[PDB]
Design an enzyme around this catalytic site. Structure first.
Site: not given
Ligand SMILES: O=P(O)(O)OC[C@H]1O[C@H](OP(=O)(O)OP(=O)(O)O)[C@H](O)[C@@H]1O
Ligand SMILES: [Mg+2]
Ligand SMILES: O=P(O)(O)OC[C@H]1O[C@H](OP(=O)(O)OP(=O)(O)O)[C@H](O)[C@@H]1O
Ligand SMILES: [Mg+2]
Lengths: 178, 176
Positions: A65, A102
Protein backbone atom coordinates in the site's frame (compact mmCIF):
# COMPACT_ATOMS: atom_id res chain seq x y z
CA UNK A 1 -7.66 22.42 7.92
CA UNK A 2 -9.79 22.01 4.78
CA UNK A 3 -7.16 20.01 2.93
CA UNK A 4 -6.93 17.62 5.88
CA UNK A 5 -10.70 17.38 5.99
CA UNK A 6 -10.67 16.22 2.36
CA UNK A 7 -8.51 13.27 3.47
CA UNK A 8 -10.17 12.51 6.83
CA UNK A 9 -13.64 12.40 5.29
CA UNK A 10 -12.47 9.72 2.80
CA UNK A 11 -11.21 7.22 5.32
CA UNK A 12 -13.77 4.47 5.71
CA UNK A 13 -13.63 2.47 8.96
CA UNK A 14 -14.60 -1.23 8.96
CA UNK A 15 -15.18 -2.87 12.33
CA UNK A 16 -13.98 -6.41 13.05
CA UNK A 17 -11.62 -6.67 10.08
CA UNK A 18 -9.57 -8.61 9.90
CA UNK A 19 -10.30 -9.93 13.41
CA UNK A 20 -13.04 -9.20 15.93
CA UNK A 21 -12.40 -5.99 17.88
CA UNK A 22 -10.09 -4.28 15.40
CA UNK A 23 -11.14 -1.43 13.15
CA UNK A 24 -9.66 -1.33 9.65
CA UNK A 25 -8.99 2.12 8.26
CA UNK A 26 -9.68 1.83 4.54
CA UNK A 27 -7.86 4.42 2.41
CA UNK A 28 -9.53 3.30 -0.82
CA UNK A 29 -11.87 6.29 -0.97
CA UNK A 30 -8.87 8.69 -0.68
CA UNK A 31 -7.44 7.08 -3.84
CA UNK A 32 -10.81 7.17 -5.59
CA UNK A 33 -11.38 10.88 -5.04
CA UNK A 34 -8.68 12.73 -6.95
CA UNK A 35 -9.04 15.86 -4.78
CA UNK A 36 -8.54 13.75 -1.65
CA UNK A 37 -5.45 12.03 -2.98
CA UNK A 38 -3.96 15.34 -4.14
CA UNK A 39 -4.60 16.83 -0.70
CA UNK A 40 -2.91 13.91 1.08
CA UNK A 41 0.19 14.09 -1.11
CA UNK A 42 0.29 17.88 -0.77
CA UNK A 43 0.08 17.74 3.00
CA UNK A 44 2.85 15.15 3.25
CA UNK A 45 5.05 17.09 0.82
CA UNK A 46 4.56 20.39 2.68
CA UNK A 47 5.46 18.78 6.00
CA UNK A 48 8.58 17.19 4.54
CA UNK A 49 9.84 20.34 2.81
CA UNK A 50 9.09 22.44 5.90
CA UNK A 51 10.98 19.98 8.08
CA UNK A 52 13.92 18.91 5.91
CA UNK A 53 14.37 21.63 3.29
CA UNK A 54 16.66 20.27 0.58
CA UNK A 55 18.07 17.44 2.67
CA UNK A 56 15.94 14.63 1.27
CA UNK A 57 17.58 12.64 -1.52
CA UNK A 58 14.92 9.92 -2.09
CA UNK A 59 11.56 8.68 -0.95
CA UNK A 60 11.32 4.96 -0.12
CA UNK A 61 7.90 3.40 -0.55
CA UNK A 62 6.86 0.21 1.25
CA UNK A 63 5.27 -2.75 -0.55
CA UNK A 64 2.33 -2.83 -1.08
CA UNK A 65 0.00 0.00 0.00
CA UNK A 66 2.97 2.36 0.45
CA UNK A 67 3.53 2.03 -3.30
CA UNK A 68 0.30 4.01 -3.73
CA UNK A 69 1.88 7.05 -2.15
CA UNK A 70 5.65 6.83 -2.69
CA UNK A 71 5.91 7.78 -6.34
CA UNK A 72 3.40 10.64 -6.15
CA UNK A 73 5.09 12.03 -3.06
CA UNK A 74 8.50 11.76 -4.66
CA UNK A 75 7.23 13.46 -7.79
CA UNK A 76 5.72 16.31 -5.79
CA UNK A 77 9.16 16.85 -4.12
CA UNK A 78 11.08 16.47 -7.40
CA UNK A 79 12.72 13.27 -6.14
CA UNK A 80 13.00 9.64 -7.14
CA UNK A 81 11.40 6.77 -5.26
CA UNK A 82 13.15 3.59 -4.18
CA UNK A 83 11.35 0.39 -3.34
CA UNK A 84 11.36 -1.82 -0.31
CA UNK A 85 9.56 -5.04 -1.09
CA UNK A 86 8.22 -8.17 0.52
CA UNK A 87 10.99 -10.77 0.25
CA UNK A 88 11.32 -12.77 -2.97
CA UNK A 89 10.26 -10.10 -5.43
CA UNK A 90 13.42 -8.15 -6.30
CA UNK A 91 16.17 -9.29 -8.71
CA UNK A 92 19.90 -8.97 -8.08
CA UNK A 93 21.81 -8.72 -4.79
CA UNK A 94 19.57 -7.87 -1.84
CA UNK A 95 19.44 -7.49 1.91
CA UNK A 96 16.45 -8.63 3.94
CA UNK A 97 15.05 -8.13 7.44
CA UNK A 98 12.45 -10.03 9.41
CA UNK A 99 9.72 -8.47 11.45
CA UNK A 100 6.65 -9.76 13.27
CA UNK A 101 3.42 -9.48 11.30
CA UNK A 102 0.18 -10.69 12.81
CA UNK A 103 0.92 -14.11 14.38
CA UNK A 104 4.08 -14.92 12.47
CA UNK A 105 7.10 -13.53 10.69
CA UNK A 106 7.51 -11.73 7.38
CA UNK A 107 10.55 -10.29 5.61
CA UNK A 108 11.21 -7.06 3.74
CA UNK A 109 13.98 -6.76 1.14
CA UNK A 110 15.90 -4.01 -0.67
CA UNK A 111 18.32 -4.09 -3.60
CA UNK A 112 21.87 -3.49 -2.38
CA UNK A 113 22.32 -0.68 -4.91
CA UNK A 114 19.07 1.07 -4.04
CA UNK A 115 21.00 3.74 -2.15
CA UNK A 116 24.64 4.77 -1.70
CA UNK A 117 26.23 5.40 1.67
CA UNK A 118 25.36 8.87 2.97
CA UNK A 119 22.16 9.34 0.99
CA UNK A 120 19.18 10.65 2.97
CA UNK A 121 15.78 9.04 2.72
CA UNK A 122 12.22 9.50 3.94
CA UNK A 123 10.11 6.35 4.20
CA UNK A 124 6.42 6.46 3.34
CA UNK A 125 3.70 3.90 4.03
CA UNK A 126 -0.09 4.13 4.19
CA UNK A 127 -0.46 3.24 7.83
CA UNK A 128 1.59 2.83 10.99
CA UNK A 129 0.21 0.23 13.39
CA UNK A 130 2.69 -1.75 15.55
CA UNK A 131 5.60 -0.18 13.66
CA UNK A 132 7.11 -3.54 12.70
CA UNK A 133 7.00 -2.91 8.98
CA UNK A 134 8.46 0.60 9.16
CA UNK A 135 11.10 -0.55 11.64
CA UNK A 136 12.26 -3.27 9.23
CA UNK A 137 12.46 -0.66 6.46
CA UNK A 138 14.65 1.56 8.63
CA UNK A 139 16.92 -1.39 9.48
CA UNK A 140 17.46 -2.14 5.81
CA UNK A 141 18.14 1.47 4.93
CA UNK A 142 20.62 1.74 7.83
CA UNK A 143 22.46 -1.34 6.54
CA UNK A 144 23.00 0.46 3.21
CA UNK A 145 24.48 3.29 5.30
CA UNK A 146 21.60 5.52 4.26
CA UNK A 147 20.29 8.09 6.72
CA UNK A 148 16.57 7.84 7.49
CA UNK A 149 15.41 11.41 8.07
CA UNK A 150 11.80 10.60 8.88
CA UNK A 151 9.05 8.01 8.39
CA UNK A 152 5.60 9.19 7.39
CA UNK A 153 2.11 7.73 6.91
CA UNK A 154 -1.44 8.75 6.16
CA UNK A 155 -2.81 6.92 9.21
CA UNK A 156 -1.40 6.16 12.65
CA UNK A 157 -3.02 3.87 15.25
CA UNK A 158 -1.77 5.58 18.38
CA UNK A 159 -2.74 2.95 20.94
CA UNK A 160 -0.24 0.55 19.34
CA UNK A 161 2.69 2.86 20.11
CA UNK A 162 4.41 2.38 16.75
CA UNK A 163 5.99 5.88 16.99
CA UNK A 164 7.92 4.69 20.07
CA UNK A 165 9.14 1.62 18.22
CA UNK A 166 10.71 3.88 15.57
CA UNK A 167 12.36 6.32 18.00
CA UNK A 168 14.74 7.93 17.57
CA UNK A 169 13.75 8.15 13.89
CA UNK A 170 11.16 10.92 13.62
CA UNK A 171 7.59 10.05 12.59
CA UNK A 172 4.66 12.02 11.20
CA UNK A 173 1.14 11.00 10.25
CA UNK A 174 -1.72 12.97 8.71
CA UNK A 175 -4.39 11.25 10.78
CA UNK A 176 -4.50 9.54 14.15
CA UNK A 177 -6.94 6.96 15.52
CA UNK A 178 -6.87 4.99 18.75
CA UNK B 1 11.14 9.63 -29.07
CA UNK B 2 13.42 11.08 -26.39
CA UNK B 3 10.65 10.81 -23.76
CA UNK B 4 10.35 7.14 -24.50
CA UNK B 5 14.13 6.90 -24.45
CA UNK B 6 14.08 8.31 -20.87
CA UNK B 7 12.01 5.24 -19.91
CA UNK B 8 13.74 2.61 -22.06
CA UNK B 9 17.18 3.53 -20.74
CA UNK B 10 16.03 3.01 -17.15
CA UNK B 11 14.94 -0.59 -17.61
CA UNK B 12 17.42 -2.98 -16.06
CA UNK B 13 17.56 -6.60 -17.21
CA UNK B 14 18.39 -9.57 -14.93
CA UNK B 15 18.86 -13.00 -16.52
CA UNK B 16 17.49 -16.08 -14.74
CA UNK B 17 15.21 -14.32 -12.26
CA UNK B 18 13.11 -15.67 -10.94
CA UNK B 19 13.85 -18.85 -12.90
CA UNK B 20 16.57 -19.92 -15.30
CA UNK B 21 16.04 -18.93 -18.93
CA UNK B 22 13.96 -15.80 -18.50
CA UNK B 23 15.05 -12.18 -18.28
CA UNK B 24 13.50 -10.01 -15.59
CA UNK B 25 12.87 -6.43 -16.72
CA UNK B 26 13.42 -4.35 -13.57
CA UNK B 27 11.47 -1.07 -13.56
CA UNK B 28 13.17 0.14 -10.34
CA UNK B 29 15.38 2.66 -12.11
CA UNK B 30 12.37 4.28 -13.80
CA UNK B 31 10.91 4.96 -10.34
CA UNK B 32 14.27 6.22 -9.03
CA UNK B 33 14.81 8.81 -11.77
CA UNK B 34 12.05 11.37 -11.45
CA UNK B 35 12.41 12.45 -15.08
CA UNK B 36 11.96 8.86 -16.25
CA UNK B 37 8.90 8.28 -14.09
CA UNK B 38 7.32 11.55 -15.22
CA UNK B 39 7.96 10.57 -18.82
CA UNK B 40 6.34 7.15 -18.38
CA UNK B 41 3.23 8.64 -16.78
CA UNK B 42 3.08 11.37 -19.41
CA UNK B 43 3.36 8.94 -22.33
CA UNK B 44 0.61 6.74 -20.89
CA UNK B 45 -1.68 9.73 -20.18
CA UNK B 46 -1.16 11.18 -23.65
CA UNK B 47 -1.99 7.85 -25.27
CA UNK B 48 -5.13 7.44 -23.19
CA UNK B 49 -6.39 10.96 -23.88
CA UNK B 50 -5.66 10.58 -27.58
CA UNK B 51 -7.60 7.29 -27.62
CA UNK B 52 -10.53 7.89 -25.27
CA UNK B 53 -10.92 11.65 -24.92
CA UNK B 54 -12.98 12.38 -21.81
CA UNK B 55 -14.63 8.95 -21.59
CA UNK B 56 -12.49 7.43 -18.82
CA UNK B 57 -14.12 7.49 -15.39
CA UNK B 58 -11.46 5.69 -13.33
CA UNK B 59 -8.02 4.13 -13.47
CA UNK B 60 -7.72 0.69 -11.82
CA UNK B 61 -4.29 -0.16 -10.47
CA UNK B 62 -3.16 -3.76 -9.92
CA UNK B 63 -1.54 -4.92 -6.65
CA UNK B 64 1.38 -4.57 -6.21
CA UNK B 65 3.65 -3.07 -8.88
CA UNK B 66 0.71 -1.50 -10.67
CA UNK B 67 0.10 0.56 -7.51
CA UNK B 68 3.30 2.41 -8.41
CA UNK B 69 1.71 3.78 -11.59
CA UNK B 70 -2.08 3.83 -10.97
CA UNK B 71 -2.44 6.85 -8.72
CA UNK B 72 0.07 9.00 -10.64
CA UNK B 73 -1.60 8.20 -13.96
CA UNK B 74 -5.02 8.86 -12.46
CA UNK B 75 -3.81 12.20 -11.08
CA UNK B 76 -2.36 13.20 -14.45
CA UNK B 77 -5.74 12.52 -16.03
CA UNK B 78 -7.75 14.17 -13.24
CA UNK B 79 -9.33 10.85 -12.23
CA UNK B 80 -9.61 8.68 -9.17
CA UNK B 81 -7.87 5.33 -8.90
CA UNK B 82 -9.60 2.13 -7.81
CA UNK B 83 -7.69 -0.80 -6.35
CA UNK B 84 -7.64 -4.46 -7.36
CA UNK B 85 -5.75 -6.45 -4.74
CA UNK B 86 -4.35 -9.88 -4.08
CA UNK B 87 -7.08 -11.76 -2.27
CA UNK B 88 -7.35 -11.39 1.50
CA UNK B 89 -6.51 -7.72 1.93
CA UNK B 90 -9.70 -5.78 1.28
CA UNK B 91 -12.48 -5.14 3.81
CA UNK B 92 -16.21 -5.35 3.05
CA UNK B 93 -18.01 -7.48 0.48
CA UNK B 94 -15.73 -8.65 -2.34
CA UNK B 95 -15.52 -10.66 -5.56
CA UNK B 96 -12.43 -12.59 -6.56
CA UNK B 97 -10.95 -14.24 -9.62
CA UNK B 98 -8.28 -16.91 -9.93
CA UNK B 99 -5.59 -17.14 -12.52
CA UNK B 100 -2.41 -19.15 -13.08
CA UNK B 101 0.76 -17.67 -11.62
CA UNK B 102 0.22 -22.48 -8.97
CA UNK B 103 -2.92 -20.44 -8.50
CA UNK B 104 -3.40 -16.88 -7.28
CA UNK B 105 -6.48 -14.68 -6.85
CA UNK B 106 -7.25 -11.00 -7.38
CA UNK B 107 -10.08 -9.30 -5.49
CA UNK B 108 -12.17 -6.14 -5.76
CA UNK B 109 -14.73 -4.56 -3.42
CA UNK B 110 -18.31 -5.04 -4.68
CA UNK B 111 -18.84 -1.26 -4.42
CA UNK B 112 -15.63 -0.25 -6.24
CA UNK B 113 -17.55 0.76 -9.37
CA UNK B 114 -21.14 1.25 -10.47
CA UNK B 115 -22.60 -0.44 -13.54
CA UNK B 116 -21.59 1.33 -16.75
CA UNK B 117 -18.60 3.16 -15.34
CA UNK B 118 -15.65 3.17 -17.73
CA UNK B 119 -12.24 2.06 -16.55
CA UNK B 120 -8.67 1.77 -17.79
CA UNK B 121 -6.54 -0.84 -16.06
CA UNK B 122 -2.81 -0.18 -15.48
CA UNK B 123 -0.04 -2.56 -14.44
CA UNK B 124 3.71 -2.39 -14.70
CA UNK B 125 4.15 -5.50 -16.89
CA UNK B 126 2.08 -7.68 -19.20
CA UNK B 127 3.47 -11.20 -19.49
CA UNK B 128 1.07 -14.13 -19.92
CA UNK B 129 -1.85 -11.71 -19.40
CA UNK B 130 -3.25 -13.80 -16.55
CA UNK B 131 -3.20 -10.97 -14.00
CA UNK B 132 -4.68 -8.40 -16.37
CA UNK B 133 -7.29 -10.88 -17.57
CA UNK B 134 -8.41 -11.55 -13.99
CA UNK B 135 -8.75 -7.82 -13.40
CA UNK B 136 -10.93 -7.48 -16.50
CA UNK B 137 -13.09 -10.38 -15.30
CA UNK B 138 -13.63 -8.67 -11.97
CA UNK B 139 -14.49 -5.32 -13.54
CA UNK B 140 -16.88 -7.03 -15.96
CA UNK B 141 -18.62 -8.72 -13.05
CA UNK B 142 -19.28 -5.25 -11.64
CA UNK B 143 -20.75 -4.34 -15.05
CA UNK B 144 -17.97 -1.81 -15.57
CA UNK B 145 -16.72 -1.20 -19.10
CA UNK B 146 -13.01 -1.82 -19.54
CA UNK B 147 -11.92 0.60 -22.23
CA UNK B 148 -8.26 -0.45 -22.34
CA UNK B 149 -5.45 -2.07 -20.41
CA UNK B 150 -1.98 -0.49 -20.35
CA UNK B 151 1.46 -1.31 -19.06
CA UNK B 152 5.02 -0.04 -19.14
CA UNK B 153 6.46 -3.33 -20.35
CA UNK B 154 5.05 -6.09 -22.58
CA UNK B 155 6.72 -9.48 -23.16
CA UNK B 156 5.48 -10.17 -26.68
CA UNK B 157 6.41 -13.84 -26.97
CA UNK B 158 3.92 -14.66 -24.21
CA UNK B 159 0.96 -13.39 -26.27
CA UNK B 160 -0.77 -11.56 -23.41
CA UNK B 161 -2.33 -9.06 -25.83
CA UNK B 162 -4.24 -11.90 -27.50
CA UNK B 163 -5.43 -13.21 -24.13
CA UNK B 164 -7.09 -9.85 -23.42
CA UNK B 165 -8.73 -9.34 -26.84
CA UNK B 166 -11.16 -7.92 -27.52
CA UNK B 167 -10.11 -5.46 -24.78
CA UNK B 168 -7.51 -3.12 -26.30
CA UNK B 169 -3.98 -3.11 -24.93
CA UNK B 170 -1.08 -0.66 -25.06
CA UNK B 171 2.49 -0.85 -23.75
CA UNK B 172 5.34 1.67 -23.74
CA UNK B 173 8.07 -0.93 -24.25
CA UNK B 174 8.19 -4.39 -25.77
CA UNK B 175 10.69 -7.23 -25.25
CA UNK B 176 10.53 -10.83 -26.41
O1 LIG C 1 2.87 -1.10 11.62
P1 LIG C 1 2.57 -2.55 11.30
O2 LIG C 1 1.97 -3.27 12.47
O3 LIG C 1 3.79 -3.25 10.72
O4 LIG C 1 1.44 -2.55 10.17
C1 LIG C 1 1.45 -1.60 9.10
C2 LIG C 1 1.61 -2.30 7.77
O5 LIG C 1 0.54 -3.24 7.59
C3 LIG C 1 -0.06 -3.06 6.31
O6 LIG C 1 0.67 -3.83 5.36
P2 LIG C 1 0.38 -5.39 5.11
O7 LIG C 1 1.55 -6.18 5.62
O8 LIG C 1 -1.01 -5.67 5.64
O9 LIG C 1 0.42 -5.55 3.51
P3 LIG C 1 -0.09 -4.66 2.27
O10 LIG C 1 0.83 -3.43 2.28
O11 LIG C 1 0.15 -5.58 1.11
O12 LIG C 1 -1.54 -4.31 2.50
C4 LIG C 1 0.15 -1.59 6.01
O13 LIG C 1 0.10 -1.31 4.61
C5 LIG C 1 1.52 -1.32 6.61
O14 LIG C 1 2.57 -1.60 5.66
MG1 LIG D 1 1.80 -2.56 3.83
O1 LIG E 1 0.89 -11.21 -17.23
P1 LIG E 1 1.23 -12.12 -16.07
O2 LIG E 1 1.89 -13.41 -16.52
O3 LIG E 1 0.03 -12.30 -15.13
O4 LIG E 1 2.38 -11.40 -15.21
C1 LIG E 1 2.32 -9.98 -14.98
C2 LIG E 1 2.20 -9.69 -13.48
O5 LIG E 1 3.29 -10.31 -12.78
C3 LIG E 1 3.87 -9.35 -11.89
O6 LIG E 1 3.15 -9.36 -10.65
P2 LIG E 1 3.46 -10.41 -9.48
O7 LIG E 1 2.28 -11.33 -9.38
O8 LIG E 1 4.79 -11.02 -9.74
O9 LIG E 1 3.37 -9.53 -8.13
P3 LIG E 1 3.87 -8.06 -7.74
O10 LIG E 1 2.91 -7.11 -8.45
O11 LIG E 1 3.67 -8.07 -6.25
O12 LIG E 1 5.31 -7.92 -8.16
C4 LIG E 1 3.66 -8.01 -12.55
O13 LIG E 1 3.67 -6.94 -11.60
C5 LIG E 1 2.29 -8.19 -13.18
O14 LIG E 1 1.24 -7.84 -12.25
MG1 LIG F 1 1.96 -7.42 -10.24
Amino acid sequence: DSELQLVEQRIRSFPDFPTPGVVFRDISPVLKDPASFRAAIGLLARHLKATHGGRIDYIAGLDSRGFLFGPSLAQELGLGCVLIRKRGKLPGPTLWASYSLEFGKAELEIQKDALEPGQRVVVVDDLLATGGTMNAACELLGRLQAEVLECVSLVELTSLKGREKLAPVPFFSLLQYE
